[PDB]
Each structure stands twice: as C-alpha cells, then as structure tokens.
Design a protein around this ligand. Structure first.
Ligand code: FDA
Lengths: 31, 35, 154, 136, 177, 82, 42, 151, 623
RNA sequence: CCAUGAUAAGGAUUAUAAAUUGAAAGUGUUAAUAUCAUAAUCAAAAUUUAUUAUUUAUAUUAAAUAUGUAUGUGUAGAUAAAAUAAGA
C-alpha cells in the first residue's frame, strides 16, 4: 500500500517526538 | 570554454530544469537502463 | 560497613542485564524500598524498574513473535526504542540506589569499602587497611590509623 | 605474568557527581536500615529538618522520569569479528563507553532549575514542617 | 540452536493467570451491552526552446565522479576559476584506512563536495566584491550543476549540493556523459 | 508548483568568528539544510538514509582496508613462495 | 512451585470443578526440568 | 626512504650438475652487479664432509663469473647448519666499498669444515640423548645409535 | 622553601658532618673517578662517559667509581616563559623520578656503584662534591641546549678551576679549604650517529631532512660491544661499600643517609593541589611505559617480536601511507630514547639483528630503512637545533624570512585554555589532546595536528603550544619538539621536505573510519563516519538520533562558521571557564585546573615573576 | 618393544488444532595415542623436575612428615566453553 507507507514514513520524518500509532495500524491493516 | 555556452553545451545529452536528488536518481536509473 | 576489602567496578549494563538474580532480587528491592521510605521520599524509579522486571520475567519463557511478520523498518526501531527507554529508567534507578547508599553511609557514620567515595566527607574515595600501602588512583600514602572520618563520640 | 603499571579501567572518578562513576559495590543491610530508622527518629524529635530537606532536594533533582528516545537512538554495540572471541576487546569497549556516559552527561534525565517537575514540592517551606506558615 | 525451554509445558509458557476474572468480565460486558441497548432505545424514542537560457550571475559547478576518485570545480560565467579543483586525494580520503573500494564512494563524494562548497562561498563573495558587486545580506547564489561519471560518489555530490539550499540555489541540473 | 564587540557578545569571548569575505586558514563547515516538508515520496526516505536512520549501531573496531592489506600480503606471499 | 503444584492437586481432588480453572492456568502442569548431574569432566 | 636492494637468495643442492652451477653463478654475478646482497646455501648434501667440497667449487665458479662480469664482492663467514651450508656475498654498495673479488682461503674453509663437522658429530652423539622424551624417544634414539643411523 | 633548606643543608660553608661523604678506609680508595648523570642519559649499557670512566679507573689502578645525579629543581616547578604553563608536569615528574630510581637500583645492586642524588643547582652541587670527594676525573655528557649547555659549561669551568660553592649569596671559593688537578671529560653520546663521524660538517650542512638521510646512508654507527666490555670490567674495580645502601634503607624502614641524598617528591619539588591535576577521562590506549632500562630493552624485544615492524611500513608497499594511531603495534620508544634510558645505538643494533634474522622475507629491509630514517630524522632535528641555537625559541621561529604570511600572533588566554584542555570542535584534535594529556604521549600525526591547529588554525602564539607539549609529553626533547613545532607552524619552511597538512586533511587521511576518535571519545560512537570530523554540521534531529547534544557534551568548535552570530546564542554556546564552571571548583581552595598560568595558580615555589604573568593572573582573576 | 582396538573432535529432524502433564540428546570420519593377538638385549623405587581450570585483608599449624614466597590502579596477545532449573 503506497499511500499507507507514504503516510507512515511522512509521520516518521515530520514527527520524531510522537509516533503515529494510527498510521502504523492503518499500514498493517492495509497490508 | 567552461563559461556561458560551453563546448559541451551542445553535447549535453540530458537536461532537466528545476529537490535535484530525485532528478539525479532518475537520470542514474535511466543510465542503468541504457547500460 | 562490614565489607571493607578491595572491590572491582562493573558497568551498569551488566547489573541491569542480570535479571531476577541480583538486580531484580525481591529481597534486595524491598531493602531499597525500605531505605527510600525511612528517608521519606517517593520510590518512583524503583517501582518503574520493579514493574519492568515483573513484565520481563513473566514473559521471558514465551517465545518471541515471528520477526518476519514484524516490519524491520518500524517495528524493530520501536522495539529498540522501548528497550533503550527501559534501560535508561533502570540506569536512573541504579544511580539513585548508589547515591542514597552513600548518603545513608555518611549520615550513619558507616565506613565504606576501599576507594569508595562518600560526597560531603570523603570526596576522593575512602581507603583503609588495604593490601597496597598507597591509595589507589591517587598514589597518596596511607597512615596506619587509616582515617577517622567522623567524630569519636557514639 | 608480566607486571604492568598501566592504570586499569577500574580507576574511579571523584569529581563527576556525588557518587563516583563506575561505583564500587555497596552492601545495604537491615542493621543499616535499623540505624537509619533510629537516626531519623532522633532527628525528627530534635526538630532538625535540614538533612531531610537536603535529601528531598537530591531526590527531586535525580528522580525525574527519563524522556522517550527518538527512533534510531540506541547504545552502540560491538561488531561481530571473525578473530575468534574478542572478549577483552568487548569488555574494554563497554567499560570505556559506560565510563564516558557519566550521570552528569545523561541527556535523557531532565535535571536543572529550568525543567518543571509537577510531582514534588519545590522548596522546604511547602513541606508539612511549615504547617503553621500556611494557615487561614 | 535447540529450544531453551523445551522441557517447560506450553501451558506454562506462559501461564495464563486471573482465570476467575473472566466470568466477572463477561457478566459486566453483558450488563454494559444491555444498558447500551436501553439508552439506544431511549434515544430512538426521543539555442532556443527547451535549451536553458543562462544568466551572467549564475556559477557553473562541475561534479565529476570517477571509479576511485571525485572532483568538484566551479567557474563563473566569464570562464574564470572561482576555486581550484577539490579531489579525494587532495582532501586525503584516498590515502587509506578504508581501502581502494571505498574510494569514490557516496559519502566520500558528499564530504568532498561539502568541503568544496564551504571553501567556495567566501571565495565567491571575494570574487563578486572584486568588481564592486556585493552579494548582499541574504546569500542566494544561483548555480548550474553539471554531473558526470555515473558512479557512487555522484549521489553523495548531489546530496551535498542539495544541502545548504539557503545559500546555494540550483537553477539547472544537467548530465554529461 | 574589540571592546564594544565583547560588551555586546559575552559568549563570543571564548570562541572565534570566521571572516565571510575571504577563506580562512582553517576552513569550518556550515550546518546543512534538510527538508522540513516533502512534496512526495523518495525524499523523506532519502533524508532518513542520509540522517543515519538505517545505520548499524556497531562501532568500527577495524578498518575496511585491513582486508585489502591481508589480500595484498597473501598475494605477495604466494609470489615469493613461487 | 512444588508447593503450589501440591496445593493445586489437593484442591482438584477436594472440589472436582476447580480442576478447569487450575488446569487452564497451568498449575497442575509439571515441568521436567532437572539440574545437571555430577560429572568430573566439567 | 632510499630504495634498499633486495637480499636475494640463490638455492643450491649437493648434486647439482656443473651446468646448473655455472648458470646459477652467472645469475649470482648478475645480481651482484645489480647490487643485491646474495645468499648461497646448499640444502641437500648429506653429511657435512661431502657438502664442503661442492660449496668450495660453487665459490670458485662464482669467483670466476664475478671476475668476468667485473662484479667485485666480499664473501662472509661460511656457516653450516645441520641441514644446510650457507654464506653471504656482499657487493660494493653504499657504506662499504669493495673493489676486488675476495673469497675465503682453503685454509679457512678447512678450519670451518672441521669446526662444523665437530659440531654436528657432538650434537648427534650427545644432545639427542637428552633433548627428547625418555620413555620412548630416548629408547628410539638409543636404537638409532646402536644401528649407527642416528646421524 | 625546599630549595632553600637543601641549599642551607648541603651548600654550607662548614658542610656539617651529617651531610659529608664518609672517607674511605684504604688509602688507595681515597681518590676515585666520578661520573655525572643527567636527564639526557640514565642508562648503564651504552654510556660513553661510563665506559671512559671505567677505562680511566682501570688504567689508574684500583680507582673506585662514583656516580652523582643532581636534579634541576628549576625545571620541575618553574613556570613557562609564555602563558605560565608548568614545566615537567607531575605526570612527567613521576616518570623522571621512577627512571632515576631504576638507574640508582641498576648502579647500586647490579654494578655495586653508589649513586648520590642531590636537589638544587647542578652547577653548585657538582663542583663542591668533586672537591669533597677528591675525584681526579669527572666524566659527563655534553648538553648543548639552553639551560643545559650553560650549566654544563659552568660545571666544567668550576671543575677545572677547583671551585667551592656556598649558597647564602652566590659565592665561589678556591680549593685551598675542603672542610690533585681534577679534569672534566665531556663526551658526545646523544645522537645516533656520533659527532666527528658525520660525512659533512654541521656548519656546512645543507638544511634538509632528505639530505641528512642520504648522508646517514653513507655514515657509520659505532658499536656497543666496546663500551659493554668496559662496563662489564667495571665490576672488577674495587668499590666503597660504606657508600652503598643497607637492607633497612632498601626496605624503606629508615630514610637514606643525609650524605647520600633523598629522592624528592611532587610536594618537595613544588607541585601544589594535586587534585586539580587529575584528569578524569577514558584512557582508550591499552599500552603503558614501564620506566627503566631493562623495561625499555624488553619493550624493544617485544615490539620486534610481536610484528610491530609493520607500524613503520605496511607489508609490500614501498610507499608511506596513513598510520593507525589507535593501534598498539607502534613502538612507544620515544620516551626511552629522549630520557636516555634506551640508547639509539642499542636500538639500531636490535633493529639490524632482527632484520638480518628475518632477511629471508623480501620486505624487512624497507621497514628497517624506515626505522633508520626516523632515527636519522631525530638526529637531523638535533643538528638543526644546534645550528639555530638560541634563535629556535624566539617568536616567529628561527627564520623570519619564511614568515611573510604569518600574522602578528594574537594571543587569547581562554582560547589557549580550551585548546590545552581539548575543548575544541575537531574530533581528531580532541582525541589527540586527550591521549597526550592522559598517557603523556601521542602519535606524530596527533602532535602535528595539535601544533598546527594552535599556531596556524587559531592564530595563537606557537610558543604556547610548544611549551604545552613540553609540559605534557613525557618524551619531551627540546630540539626535536621545538623544531617540529616551528616546521609544522609554517615558521621553518625548508623545501624538499614533508608538507604541512591541514588538521582536516589529517583527520580524513589517518582517521577516515574514525576508530581513533570513537575510541578516545566514546560518546561520539553513534555518529556515522561520513559525519565524524564535522559533528557540528548535524541538525537537531540527527544529533538527537546519534546521542550527541552540542553544548551539553562535545561543545561547538572554537572556529565558528560564517555567520553563527545570528543563529546562535548563549543558550547554545556554553562557556567552560566562567565563574560558575567546574574548572573553578577545584584545587580544594579554588583557583582552576590545568591550563593557562597553572604554575602561577598552583605552584608553591615561583622564581623571578614576570609582568606578563602578573597581568595574565590579574585578567584571570577579573574574568 | 605387542599394532592393533578404543577414545578425542563431532554434527542429523518430524510432532495441525484441541486434550493431556504431557509425546521427546544422536553418530561417521579425520586425527592423535596406547598397557591387546602378532618381529631377544633391557623404566617403576635412590624420585628435583619443571606435567591448564588455586584459599586476596575483624580472629589464621592438635595427632601418619604435610609448603617462606608473585601485595603493586587487577592493566596484553591468543585459547577454551554454554543456548541443558533456571530467568539473551
Ligand atoms: C609538534 C611536535 C612535537 C614533537 C614531535 C613532533 C611534532 C610534530 N616529535 C616527533 C614525533 O612526534 C615522535 O618522534 C614520534 O611520534 C614518537 O612516536 P613513536 O615512538 O611511536 O615513533 P616510532 O615508533 O617511529 O619510534 C622511532 C623513533 O624515531 C624517532 N622519531 C620518529 N619520528 C620522528 C620525528 N617525526 N621526528 C623526530 N624523531 C622521530 C623517535 O626517537 C622515535 O622513538 C617529538 N619526538 C620526540 O622524541 N620528542 C618530542 O618532544 C617531540 N615533540
């Protein structure tokens, strides 16, 4: 899932202090 | 002559107008495909 | 205290890696809790390392989940982050334990082991009745009445 | 067999923090706990709260929750060499790294007057020994 | 290689505690679902063309990566050398401690290009001020990047030139074979 | 799609400032600039790659040139053994 | 652990219906782990 | 550093034919002209009594070839190990200048041969009884001494 | 005060009975032959003076041999000329005293030669002891350095003129009272190639390292067996057992007899507040230097055996490449060669024997030639220092003709403090400084980097760096140290020689992987090798990922980049020597630690203070 | 003086899910050595002769003669070992 991977990696790059558990869940669900 | 219009100005195969890291990666991929 | 011989020093990572044998030994942890309580201060880092050790020891028997399913890009980094965070909390607890042991020694007129520093009254490592005549790490010669750190009475 | 005057890694540092880094092992017994209880009882009966205030200040300074490490932050590990077991090299590297990582240089621990610690009383006046000073 | 806890039972690896709480949790869940149904019912009731056109202020930067070397040079529009070529051997990275294989690597090219640009900026300012052309408080110099070689150091060089984008602005990125 | 300078800057007394006009005898590099916002993919990925995100924590205890030196030594050993 | 196993077995013998919770919690499951025997080689 | 000349070694064996000796001597003279310090060692010669005349003949051949090629050199002390007999030829290079071809005399060669023969005989007849294990190696060495093949 | 009491005890007009060398029993043993030891030679294996004294005693008959060693009290506790640095820091002083004790043990227990150790002025102590002992021949080595050449000349003049010394004033006396016409023999034994054997004269010597290497190619080296034979025959000479130490003195139950001498300590020499001189850093190196002569010989043999020859040149290269400063295969023999414990002739003989034994390999000759080249480079620096004379130690080097591009030597005490404490931004320079300050030794590349960074990199005076390296490095040879400092500070610009390379070039060349920097500063272990040697370039995210917070640990570089005055503030630029710094909180009273004007701040005995030193102290107090 | 056997080093892989407290260590060969079935001149009491896994600082020789020399900041290179009632 290109969109989910892009969202997770954008979260990782932009917000190092806080991780997006929502984005991680979306990625693993779409996978 | 390396200034203004140069000897290789007409012999430049690939020109891309403007990050440039993506451009460089794409050009390297095209060269890899060619070779 | 009763132990006054020469001692070697070990990295805190080694004692942290030692699980419910020395570092997480319940009797030793209860002694540390009593030391904090009798001084009337909270035991937050001790309780944090206690719950961490309980959770680790409860599931140490279980096999790890399949690493193929876990994403090396994110899951492995998250696991490393959590492990480092737990290790840092345990480091803080270890440092607090050593600091408060030194402080209680100084208050109770307890002479520590050789080359042990008690801030406030030794500041350079108390050494007494050692195998080497000279003070280690300082090369200062030592008298036979080694050092009276505290006042005589009581 | 050979005799070496080399200062080993077991050298203690008596100027970095109240407790010397790479501290010597300490044995805290119940006799020490009982003596501490007796001393605290005598001190609180006499009314001298200065030592308790100093202990509270030390605890407030050195008992704060570490911060969440950003992803990618991990302690360095020793490479897996093919030259058998470099046990001594691994031990030296680990000891050197932990000696360098002094408690004063612990960046994860929030220490100093700048940080706010919403769990402990800031000054001895807030403690219950000054109950008469906070009335009506 | 073998299992460490093979002699421990599966029901013991790990042992599930708190069995007595499951019945209470199930009954509480039933009651919560019942009251949720009740409140739901209550609510329900209620030269030309594509060829680039250059400018006299733009500096031509050449990045030539080799099999075991890399070079970064710059020239003004007139055709004068702003600064001499910076090579891996000139910087000392080719000397060793990494092997001949590491010569002309991505990181090597990146650091060589970064050093060359850092040394270029004051030299470029001095060259501009020689003819009474101040750079200004905000340094935004336009450069045309020309990359040659098709090697690992090329990626490092382009990353280095992409860095410090506040001072350097890339106008055209061209490749020469 | 001088005196006044030190009065004004009390921290700068213990440091030194390079001249922007001309290159100094000791070159010092400026901090690099990274992309706060990425237009698309393969940009944040490259930034993570260049930030050391995917770099092994293992510390280099031996140089990579040791293998090359050993290979050259073995070649010369075979040569003089011939 | 041995005491817990003995008490669990006694409870199961006394009240038969207590067998299910203890068995599901793995209190009657014996582990065959045993310390290494004596050997002059080691 | 200034380039040091390689310390070349030319192997020899007891039983080399005079053609091979001549060729090796020519090569030795060539390397001496090039300035390399050369080493001549006889590897397989049996007993030290038979390995010395061949070494002397090799020295004579090297001397003749050096005289022909104008490669002046000085021969060092001849040292006989148990397995080999070796010597070093130093050409005129650097600190020590040598303008003439110098070789040990037959008197010196005979003295060296007698000394080395005595050393080898004393070693085989004395050291071997003690330098090995007693229960089996010593008994085997005594058997070798009885057979006369302990050499 | 210790110097004053030593003078009042020994250099007294009456010379009381306690501080009097006992007379011999046999009339023949009344006279003897004396030898003077110094910091340039503390060996008994290849001492030309010792061999000559043994031969003289043998020729005279049963003449006993006596040894005297007077320490230069000034060199241990007097401040440096520029910046008030210490001379012979306690790390060096302990090594010097241990080497002296090893030499005394070697002479008194193996050779049965009584060595008398004295403290104070050599030019005062030596002639008076000559007069009192009635020595006929005084054998000593030729010192040719400032504060050593002059004292040697004074010593030989006073020996020739038979002069007694009393030290209430600076007063000399004839030999009419002593309450034979002695001769002093000064011998040259410092250089590997003995003087009068050089293929070209020193005066007409062309200034060039490669030229001297080509000269040493033709030049010969004296053997050591000739002097070893004399040393061995020295044992057959009769000795005065009354001057030898007793079992109780050896065990340390009682102090040595007052006429013999007492080895001084740090406090006696003048080192005050030792707690401020304890460096609490990680010692990454795993090799030490056991002081002594037998220890030096064992170290040489071990370095030859364990394959240490590859440190000179890698196998099958024939071309010099980057060194491995983090390795333990290097020959750490510079202290033993500078202090005279190991003789260059003995080391050369060991190298020659090893090369001959392993000559079957086709590359040992190149490594031997490299080692001989380095020894000849040391000798060349000695010769160049002799040629320069006193001009070597002046400002802008000995040759002002090469200093056209040099600035006016701006001097900043805080910059010098940070440089000498290693608080810069270059990991290579920081690691080299840490190694030098902890171990007392650092590699040639590290020394080059430090001296170039202080002189040309920062614009500070080169004498400050030279004197700091003198204070730290246990292998401090005046000529070699100052000549190398001048050469790598772009003061002596002789062509046809090694190029002066940037600190960045050295970091990229000899430490490209960064093993050395990550080992001596293990807090930087997480930084990738692309970003090491420039960690200030890292952004906030990258530095948080790699666990290196600038300003907190590993502060910003001394040389800020272009700008850096608008994007940085006092929050980022953290001070290290302010009123509320850890550096002030030391010395158990509070003066500072190790650095600028440290002798003034800590030293107990200070002689001839300077206006610059007083002004610097006042500025430090104000700031 | 019997050359012939053992040993050293030393590995293999099926057990789904429910139930059960259960249903869970296996060796060629290459090596060295040796006291056995095989080929006569010489080891076991008169032992110096150098043969890997040892007790480090409150109290230290009484029953077969039962150890006086290595304190030195525990500081190298190499070598061996294990996932076994423990807690990577
Ligand atoms: C700023 C500065 C200051 C100094 C020095 C250099 C520089 C740049 N040197 C020279 C050099 O730093 C030093 O000789 C070696 O680095 C010592 O390391 P090793 O013993 O491992 O050399 P190595 O293993 O090569 O030892 C061989 C011997 O050769 C000699 N040698 C080697 N390199 C030399 C060089 N470059 N110059 C002179 N002799 C050299 C030394 O006697 C050394 O012991 C020096 N040296 C010294 O003995 N005392 C000093 O006080 C100084 N000071």
């Amino acid at each position: 899932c290109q969109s989910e991977t892009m969202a997770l990696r954008l979260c990782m790059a932009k917000a190092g202090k806080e991780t997006c558990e929502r984005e991680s869940r979306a990625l693993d669900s779409c996978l | 002559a390396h200034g203004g219009i140069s000897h290789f100005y007409g012999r430049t195969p690939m020109v891309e107008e403007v990050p440039i890291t993506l451009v460089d990666r794409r050009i390297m991929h095209y060269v890899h495909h060619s070779r | 205290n009763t132990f006054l011989t020469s001692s070697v020093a070990t990295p805190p990572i080694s004692v942290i890696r030692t699980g419910p044998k020395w570092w997480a030994h319940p009797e030793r942890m209860v002694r540390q809790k009593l030391m904090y309580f009798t001084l009337g201060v909270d035991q937050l880092p001790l309780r944090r390392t206690a719950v961490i050790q309980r959770d680790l020891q409860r599931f140490h028997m279980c096999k790890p989940p399949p690493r193929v399913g876990d994403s090396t890009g994110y899951k492995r980094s998250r696991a490393a982050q959590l492990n480092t965070w737990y290790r840092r909390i345990q480091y803080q607890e270890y440092h607090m334990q050593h600091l408060f042991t030194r402080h209680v020694w100084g208050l109770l007129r307890v002479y520590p082991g050789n080359t042990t520093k008690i801030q406030g009254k030794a500041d350079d490592g108390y050494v007494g009745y050692d195998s080497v005549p000279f003070h280690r790490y300082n090369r200062a010669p030592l008298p036979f009445p080694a050092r009276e750190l505290y006042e005589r009475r009581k | 067999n050979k005799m070496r005057s080399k200062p080993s890694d077991n050298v203690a540092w008596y100027d970095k923090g109240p407790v010397e880094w790479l501290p010597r092992p300490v044995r805290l017994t119940y006799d020490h706990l009982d003596q501490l209880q007796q001393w605290t009882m005598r001190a609180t009966l006499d009314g001298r709260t200065e030592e308790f205030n100093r202990i509270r200040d030390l605890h407030r300074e050195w008992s704060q929750h570490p911060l969440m490490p950003v992803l990618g932050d991990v302690e360095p590990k020793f490479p897996l060499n093919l030259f058998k077991q470099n046990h001594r090299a691994k031990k030296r590297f680990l000891v050197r790294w932990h000696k360098a990582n002094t408690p004063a240089n612990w960046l994860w621990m929030p220490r100093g007057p700048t940080v706010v610690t919403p769990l402990h009383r800031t000054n001895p006046t807030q403690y219950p020994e000054n109950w008469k000073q906070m009335v009506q | 290689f073998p299992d460490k806890y093979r002699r421990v039972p599966m029901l013991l690896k790990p042992q599930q505690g708190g069995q007595q709480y499951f019945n209470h949790f199930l009954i509480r869940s039933t009651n919560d679902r019942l009251t949720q149904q009740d409140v739901d019912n209550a609510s329900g009731q209620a030269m030309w063309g594509e060829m680039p056109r250059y400018t006299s202020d733009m500096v031509f930067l050449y990045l030539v990566s080799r099999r075991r070397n890399t070079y970064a040079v710059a020239y003004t529009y007139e055709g004068k050398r702003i600064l001499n070529t910076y090579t891996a051997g000139n910087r000392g990275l080719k000397g060793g401690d990494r092997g001949f294989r590491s010569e002309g690597s991505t990181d090597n090219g990146h650091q060589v290009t970064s050093m060359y640009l850092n040394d270029l900026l004051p030299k470029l300012r001095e060259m501009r001020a020689s003819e009474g052309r101040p750079m200004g408080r905000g340094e935004k110099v336009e450069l045309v990047v020309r990359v040659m070689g098709f090697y690992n150091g090329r990626q490092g060089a382009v990353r280095a030139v992409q860095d410090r984008a506040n001072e350097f602005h890339v106008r055209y990125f061209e490749d020469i074979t | 799609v001088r005196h006044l300078y030190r009065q004004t800057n009390p921290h700068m007394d213990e440091y030194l400032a390079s001249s922007n006009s001309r290159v100094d005898t000791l070159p010092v590099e400026r901090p690099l600039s990274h992309a706060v916002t990425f237009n698309s993919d393969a940009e944040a990925e490259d930034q993570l790659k260049w930030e050391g995100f995917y770099a092994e924590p293992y510390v280099d205890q031996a140089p990579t040139s040791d293998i090359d030196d050993m290979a050259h030594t073995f070649m010369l050993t075979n040569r003089w053994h011939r | 652990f041995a005491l817990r196993m003995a008490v669990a077995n006694a409870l199961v013998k006394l009240i038969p219906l207590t067998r299910i919770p203890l068995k599901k919690s793995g209190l009657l499951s014996v582990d065959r782990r045993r310390e290494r025997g004596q050997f002059p080689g080691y | 550093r200034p380039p040091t000349k390689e310390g070349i070694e030319v192997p020899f064996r007891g039983g080399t034919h005079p053609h091979a000796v001549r060729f090796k001597s020519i090569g030795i003279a060539k390397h001496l002209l090039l300035g390399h310090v050369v080493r001549i060692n006889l590897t397989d010669f049996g007993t030290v009594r038979e390995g010395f005349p061949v070494f002397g003949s090799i020295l004579d051949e090297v001397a003749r070839q050096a005289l022909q090629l104008h490669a002046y050199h000085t021969a060092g002390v001849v040292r006989a190990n148990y397995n080999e007999v070796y010597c070093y030829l130093y050409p005129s290079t650097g600190r020590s200048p040598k303008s003439t071809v110098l070789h040990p005399t037959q008197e010196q060669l005979a003295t060296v041969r007698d000394r080395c023969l005595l050393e080898r005989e004393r070693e085989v007849y004395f050291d071997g009884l003690y330098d090995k294990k007693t229960p089996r190696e010593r008994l085997t060495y005594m058997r070798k001494l009885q057979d006369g093949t302990a050499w | 005060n210790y110097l004053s009491e030593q003078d009042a005890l020994y250099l007294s007009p009456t010379t009381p009975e306690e501080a009097r060398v006992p007379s011999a029993l046999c009339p023949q043993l009344s006279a003897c032959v004396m030898v003077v030891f110094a910091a340039n030679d503390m060996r008994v294996h290849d001492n030309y003076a010792l061999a000559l004294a043994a031969t003289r005693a043998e020729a005279a008959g049963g003449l006993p041999v006596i040894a005297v060693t007077v320490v230069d009290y000034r060199m241990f506790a007097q401040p440096s000329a520029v910046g008030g640095f210490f001379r012979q820091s306690p790390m060096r002083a302990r090594f010097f005293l241990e080497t002296l004790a090893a030499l005394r043990y070697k002479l008194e227990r193996e050779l049965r030669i009584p060595l008398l150790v004295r403290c104070g002025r050599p030019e005062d102590h030596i002639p008076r002891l000559v007069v009192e002992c009635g020595a006929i021949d005084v054998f000593l080595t030729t010192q040719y350095a400032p504060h050593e050449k002059e004292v040697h000349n004074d010593i030989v003049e006073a020996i020739n003129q038979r002069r007694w010394v009393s030290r209430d004033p600076t007063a000399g006396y004839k030999a009419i009272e002593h309450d034979a016409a002695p001769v002093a023999h000064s011998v040259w034994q410092t250089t590997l190639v003995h003087i009068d054997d050089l293929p070209v004269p020193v005066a007409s010597m062309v200034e060039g390292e490669r030229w001297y290497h080509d000269d040493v190619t033709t030049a010969n080296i004296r053997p050591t067996a000739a002097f070893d034979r004399c040393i061995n025959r020295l044992s057959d000479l009769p000795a005065r057992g009354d001057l030898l130490p007793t079992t109780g003195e050896l065990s340390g139950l009682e102090p040595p007899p007052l006429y013999r001498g007492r080895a001084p300590t740090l406090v006696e020499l003048g080192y005050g507040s030792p707690e401020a001189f304890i460096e609490e850093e990680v010692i990454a190196t795993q090799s030490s230097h056991p002081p002594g002569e037998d220890a030096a010989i064992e170290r040489v043999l071990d370095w030859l055996m364990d394959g240490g020859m590859t440190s000179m040149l890698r196998y099958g290269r024939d071309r010099r490449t980057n060194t491995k400063m983090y390795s333990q295969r290097l020959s750490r023999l510079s202290p033993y060669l500078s202090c005279g414990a190991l003789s260059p002739r003995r080391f050369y003989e060991e190298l020659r024997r090893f090369t001959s034994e392993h000559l079957r390999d086709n590359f040992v000759q190149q490594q031997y030639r490299e080692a001989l080249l380095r020894l000849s480079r040391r000798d060349y620096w000695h010769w160049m220092g002799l040629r320069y004379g006193p001009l070597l130690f002046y400002e802008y080097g000995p040759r002002p003709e090469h200093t056209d591009d040099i600035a006016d030597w701006r001097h900043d005490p805080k910059i010098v403090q940070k440089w000498c404490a290693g608080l810069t931004g270059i990991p290579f320079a920081d690691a080299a400084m840490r190694e030098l300050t902890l171990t007392g030794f650092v590699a040639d590349e590290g020394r080059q980097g430090l001296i170039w960074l202080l002189s040309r990199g920062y614009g500070q005076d080169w004498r400050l760096g030279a004197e700091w390296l003198e204070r730290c490095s246990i292998d401090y040879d005046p000529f070699v140290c100052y000549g190398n400092c001048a050469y790598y500070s772009e003061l002596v610009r002789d062509d046809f020689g090694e190029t002066v390379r940037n600190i960045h070039w050295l970091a990229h060349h000899h430490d490209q992987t960064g093993i050395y920097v990550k080992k001596w500063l293990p807090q930087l272990s997480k930084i990738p090798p692309v970003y090491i040697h420039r960690p200030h370039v890292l952004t906030e995210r990258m530095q948080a990922m790699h666990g290196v917070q600038l300003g907190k640990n590993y502060p910003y570089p001394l040389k800020l980049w272009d700008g850096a005055q608008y994007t940085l503030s006092s929050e980022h630029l953290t001070t290290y020597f302010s009123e509320g710094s850890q550096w002030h909180r030391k010395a158990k009273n509070g003066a500072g630690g190790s650095g600028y004007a440290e002798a003034l701040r800590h030293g107990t005995v200070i002689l001839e203070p300077h206006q610059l030193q007083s002004s610097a102290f006042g500025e430090l107090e104000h700031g």
